[PDB]
């Protein structure tokens, strides 16, 4: 049979940057969902010392 690409051939066309270099050594492939995983939650659950300790979600307790 004629030659067909193996896994190593695919890895050639498989990096984040097609021609790797030191400047792009640590560049990572994009997530398949195109959705970067959520970071630490930026919720302002500020507990107000009403002494009554009580948190809020900006408006709501």
């Amino acid at each position: 049979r004629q030659w067909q690409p193996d896994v190593e051939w695919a890895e050639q066309f498989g990096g984040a940057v097609m021609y790797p270099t030191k400047e792009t050594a640590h560049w990572k492939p994009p997530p398949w969902n195109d959705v970067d995983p959520p970071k630490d939650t930026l919720v302002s659950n500020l507990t107000l010392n009403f002494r009554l300790v009580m948190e809020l979600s900006g408006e709501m307790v």
């Binding site: 940057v17 021609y19 270099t21 400047e23 792009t24």
Partner: protein, 55 residues
């Protein structure tokens, strides 16, 4: 020596190597708005003033 060592490294590989290096940093920016818009600032300044396109 000539055919498949030099004649392939004079035209083919050198142009491939030249195109390789240029494509290295053209495709590799940093994704920072500060660096981008700053490169806009020179581009606008150099366009009007020193290429003399206003004249």
């Amino acid at each position: 020596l000539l055919d498949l060592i030099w004649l392939e490294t004079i035209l083919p590989k050198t142009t491939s190597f030249i195109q390789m290096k240029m494509s290295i940093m053209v495709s590799n920016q940093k994704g920072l708005i500060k660096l981008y818009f700053l490169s806009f600032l020179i581009t606008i300044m150099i366009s009007m003033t020193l290429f003399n396109y206003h004249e």
